[PDB]
Design a binder for this molecule. Structure first.
Ligand SMILES: C[C@H](C[C@@H](C[C@H](C[C@@H](C[C@@H](CCN1CCCC1=O)N1CCCC1=O)N1CCCC1=O)N1CCCC1=O)N1CCCC1=O)N1CCCC1=O
Ligand SMILES: COc1cc(CCNC(=O)c2nc(-c3cccc(C(F)(F)F)c3)[nH]c(=O)c2O)ccn1
Ligand SMILES: [Mn+2]
Ligand SMILES: [Mn+2]
Length: 180
């Protein structure tokens, strides 16, 4: 209790995103009061996922991340049963109604190369698109198909570097980097 990471997450991120990240950690047996770095990562991942869905058209994306585990699996069943795409192994983040594929969003504190390899080895049915962002402004997507336009993607990298900057200004970034 009483971690600077917790008060920064509550001050930096959206109240709804903080609430959405708290439920996800509660449900998966984690405690944002103590597991404060994973609390900051869950909030960051949520925000990026929400800006990404805002980058396309109105009915472009279906948001999977940010729903309770049971409701998230229900909507992918409807997506699989009306489109014909195969059921993803683990839960993804989005679905592309324009490109007809699921999307896996990733935010990393390392080389964009390593994370995607990790995210690719657990989805052997490589039908799901994988998209990595980085806190240093680098990105990395499947088949070089970065899905969105450059302006929407650049907005994501800008916000990511602001979070890393605010984290470092409070001497929190060093603990956040050497923990992923
Ligand atoms: C409605 C409720 C929650 C939605 C919220 C989700 C997030 C969206 C919020 C919008 C407003 N903006 C835009 C400006 C800032 C802001 O705050 N953005 C996008 C940027 C960051 C953010 O926060 N979106 C997306 C569509 C419109 C909307 O509101 N969520 C939560 C998880 C899944 C979901 O659809 N719903 C709807 C049914 C299920 C549920 O929980
Ligand atoms: C906190 O609730 C959870 C939930 C799960 C299963 C569901 N998870 C996802 O869907 C997911 N998780 C991450 C992620 C972010 C930081 C650290 C880690 C890891 F260190 F645990 F690997 C993963 N990034 C994504 O992009 C992503 O989609 C697992 C654990 N905790
Ligand atoms: Mn997810
Ligand atoms: Mn993800």
């Amino acid at each position: 209790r009483g971690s600077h990471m917790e008060d920064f997450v509550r001050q930096c991120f959206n109240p709804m995103i903080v609430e959405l990240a708290e439920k996800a950690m509660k449900e998966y047996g984690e405690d944002p009061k103590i597991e404060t770095n994973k609390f900051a990562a869950t909030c960051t991942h949520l925000e990026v996922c929400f800006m990404y869905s805002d980058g396309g058209s109105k009915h472009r994306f279906e948001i999977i991340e940010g729903r309770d585990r049971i409701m998230a699996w229900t909507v992918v069943n409807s997506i699989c049963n009306t489109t014909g795409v195969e059921k993803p192994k683990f839960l993804p983040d989005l679905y592309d109604y324009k490109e007809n594929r699921f999307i896996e969003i990733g935010v990393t504190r390392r080389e964009v190369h390593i994370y995607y390899l990790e995210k690719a080895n657990k989805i052997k049915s490589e039908k799901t698109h994988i998209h990595i962002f980085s806190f240093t402004g680098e990105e990395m997507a499947t088949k070089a198909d970065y899905t969105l336009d450059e302006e929407s993607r650049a907005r994501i990298k800008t916000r990511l570097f602001t979070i890393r900057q605010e984290m470092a200004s409070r001497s929190l970034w060093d603990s956040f980097r050497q923990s992923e």
